Amino acid sequence: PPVVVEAHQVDTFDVPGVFYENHPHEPHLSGMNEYNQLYQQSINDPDTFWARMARDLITFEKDFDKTHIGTLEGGDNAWFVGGRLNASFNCVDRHAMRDPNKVAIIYEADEPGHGRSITYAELLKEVSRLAWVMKSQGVRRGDTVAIYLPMIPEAIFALLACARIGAIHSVVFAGFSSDSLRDRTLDARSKFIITTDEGKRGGKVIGTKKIVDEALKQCPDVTSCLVFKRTGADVPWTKGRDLWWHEEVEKYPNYLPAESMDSEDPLFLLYTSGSTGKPKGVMHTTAGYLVGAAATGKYVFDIHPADRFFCGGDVGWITGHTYVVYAPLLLGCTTVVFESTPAYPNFSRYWDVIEKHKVTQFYVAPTALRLLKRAGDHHINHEMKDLRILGSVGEPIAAEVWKWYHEVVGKRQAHIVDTYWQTETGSHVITPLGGITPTKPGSASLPFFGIDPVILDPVTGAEIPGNDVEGILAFRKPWPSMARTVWGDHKRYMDTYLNVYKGFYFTGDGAGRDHEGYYWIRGRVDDVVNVSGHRLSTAEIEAALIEHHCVAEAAVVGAVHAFVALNREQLRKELIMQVRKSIGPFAAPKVVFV
Ligand SMILES: CCCOP(=O)(O)OC[C@H]1O[C@@H](n2cnc3c(N)ncnc32)[C@H](O)[C@@H]1O
Ligand SMILES: [Mg+2]
Predict the structure, then answer these.
(1) Distance from the CA of 417 to the center of ligand 1, in angstroms?
(2) Which Pfam family, just one, is annotated for this protein (predicted)?
(3) What residues flank ligand 1, with Cβ below 6 Å?
(4) Labelling 190: which of 142, 198, 362, 438 has CA 20 to 30 A away?
(5) Atom of ligand 1 nearest to the CA of 528
(6) Phi first, then psi: what are they for 523, rounded to 5°?
(7) Measured between alpha carbons, how far is 35 from 41 in angstroms, rounded to an integer?
(8) Residues 6 or more apart whose Cβ sits within 8 Å of residue 416
(9) Is residue 406 part of a domain?
(10) SS3 355
(11) What is the DSSP letter of 494?
């Protein structure tokens, strides 16, 4: 009888031998022996291991005094204390100083055959003069800055310009409604917001400026709204508040000094929905987050400086934060900013992009892979000679989809890396290491460096030791890129993550660890449901539906559904519009019951 039934008779797949033959460089680890050696040091002497890793990967303005203080139960963890650094220096300046004409960003626009490439020197200029705009409009170190931007390179300019002056960027997914944008801007107390006149995605127009205008009536602390002219459409304009990106940046110099930030100064807020109530502003600080981003970029995704890294995620979510922006730029390679969808103009789009730009690592969600698999294999007829790493994030990749990814997309030539992590962990925590770790379809494999996973009994909270076990997934030790608080609400941070099982970090996920020690993520044990790549609160959908006058009691379960007690076919459609106003289109239920 097998406790972890999903692993019954599943063999490990070695890295394809052709991966090493075709590799342009020498990979970072010699094999699984070195992983085990480094992993054991990361658990048994994290002070030594992470000091060396941080000093390898991150340039500090002032070296740090101590690797880590605090404990999980104390909720007081600090990493690289005494250090000083700047995230934009590490993502931009240090690379522009060595190789100014190296391409940092490839922008792939909604329409094929547009876009452009941006060098590290060009990125330094744009980050600098955008930072000048913010400084000139009164943004100071420690202020938050709301960002409501689509996938254009200007989004990277905005994150890194905020980091350059020590402002705390608070990115809001550009598909959120006015109410959601308002809620996040109010909670973050931002006085400055950055957006576009409109977005273009999949040939469709998104009225970003209109949505922002609606949200800002209820954000009177916002006194500046910088608008990037993406489409040039006539948009309403608020004199004295609104500013044109292109008019303002050209007033200011092409260089700006970077603020000397503490290791533990906040870098950003990322609002995420939890099991109960209002969105949590998950706060990441500076040094530990960047160290985790660079370490996983390097050792999980096998990133080398010449690589062309393509994450299909959106900057509005943590995957885009860590792997579109911070990790590849920290490591000095090229990152791809993709404005379109995998289906526009046709289902070949992902592969057209990878082929044209010779992408070396591609990172997407299984939801997109399932869509494309249903579309048919004739859409894929691309050499994609340099594609050696195929990443998957957000949900377990099913053996049927894993095989299609490995064979049809990767030509049995690429290593498939199923990365498990969350907004709160900053970077990958359970994952194979690209080009190193043997994999199992449907399994996230083994812990990353510094991650000490344990399986707990959900009721008694006790550790369940050894292999072939199942239960709650928790981590036993702090790690550098862990979220440090929930903005304005440290007690909620403690209660949610650290007080449930004292001494451990609670992921909210169930998991099994099979006879080989490989982990298999079972999904959320709480009321978080994943629909089409989004982390949505069933209570948030419940609260939205209830706000309608004819709805009394509302229940939402997970494709989310909604059984409500109140024409009955007319009301079924009217509740959807109420969700569209409270959250956004991507949170409307798939069926509405009465
Ligand atoms: C990392 C981007 C998604 O970040 P979020 O904070 O939005 O969601 C994290 C949650 O997604 C699932 N999850 C994430 N990665 C995996 C994964 N690879 N396998 C299974 N479930 C996964 C797990 O339930 C987890 O608690
Ligand atoms: Mg007002």
Answers:
(1) 14
(2) ACAS_N
(3) 272, 318-319, 393-396, 418-423, 444, 507-509, 521, 523-524, 535
(4) 198
(5) 24
(6) 110, 175
(7) 10
(8) 390, 391, 392, 397, 402, 405, 406, 410, 439
(9) yes
(10) helix
(11) I
CA distance 562 to 549: 16
Amino acid in position 405: Y
Phi, psi angles (nearest 5°) of residue 280: -90, 125
- The β-bridge partners of 392 are 364, 418
- Nearest residue CA, atom 7 of ligand 1? 535
Tell me the CA–centroid distance for residue 422 and ligand 1, in Å.
5
* DSSP output for 69-92: E--TTTT--EEEET-EE-HHIIII
**Among 390, 420, 496, 536, which residue has the most ligand 1 atoms within 8 Å of its CB, making it the best to mutate?**
420
Q: Which residues partner with 73 through β-bridges?
A: none
Nearest ligand 1 atom, CA 397: 19
Handedness of CA 182, 321, 330, 284 (dihedral sign): positive
Distance 252 CA to ligand 1 centre (A): 41
Here the tokens at position 83 are 């250090």
Peptide bond into 345 cis (omega under 30): yes
User: Is residue 506 a contact partner of residue 75, using CB atoms and an 8 Å limit?
Assistant: no
Protein residue closest via CA to atom 10 of ligand 1:
422
**Which atom of ligand 1 sits closest to the CA of residue 419?**
18
Count of CB atoms situated within 10 Å of the CB of 112 = 16
Q: Give me ligand 2 centre to Cα 212, in Å.
A: 13
Give the domain CATH number at 79: 3.40.50.12780
> Is 291 a member of any domain?
yes
385-400 as b/e: b if 16+ CB within 10 A: ebbbbbbbbbbbbeee
Which DSSP category does 360 fall into?
A: S
Per the structure block, which two tokens stand in for 537? 């609160």
**Distance, CA of 82 to CA of 122 (rounded, Å):** 32
Angle at 564 between CA 562 and CA 567, to 5 degrees: 110
What three-state secondary structure class fits 2? coil
- How do 334-338 and 103-108 pair as beta strands? parallel
User: Max Cα separation, the chain?
Assistant: 71
DSSP secondary structure letters along 308-372 = EEEE-S-TTSHHIIIIIIIHHHHHT-EEEEE-S-TTSSSTTHHHHHHHHHT-SEEEE-HHHHHHH
Separation between Cα atoms, residue 362 and residue 323, nearest integer Å: 10
Instruction: State the CB neighbour count (10 A cutoff) for residue 196.
Output: 26
Distance 190 CA to ligand 2 centre (A): 14
Could you tell me the distance, in angstroms and rounded to a whole number, from the CA of residue 578 to the centre of ligand 2? 23
Count of domains in the chain?
1
Q: State the binding site for Mg(2+).
A: 217
Give me the half-sphere count of Cα atoms (radius 13 Å) on the Cβ side of residue 241.
19
Rounded to the nearest angstrom, the distance between the alpha carbon of 108 and the centre of ligand 1 is 26
Kindly report the protein residue whose alpha carbon is nearest to atom 5 of ligand 1.
422
Q: Which residues are annotated as a binding site?
A: 217
Domain that holds residue 227: 5-513
Q: Using an 8 Å Cβ cutoff, are 163 and 130 in contact?
A: no
Residue 528 belongs to a domain:
no
Final resolution, Å: 2.2
> For strand 192-196 and strand 224-228, is the pairing parallel, antiparallel, or unpaired?
parallel
| Residue 293 within a domain | yes
Residue owning the nearest CA to atom 8 of ligand 1 = 422
Q: Nearest 5°: CA angle at 357, between 356 and 360? A: 120
Residue 216 CA: which ligand is closest? Answer: 2
The residue nearest atom 18 of ligand 1, judged by CA position, is 420
Sign for the CA dihedral angle at 387, 450, 326, 366 comes to: positive
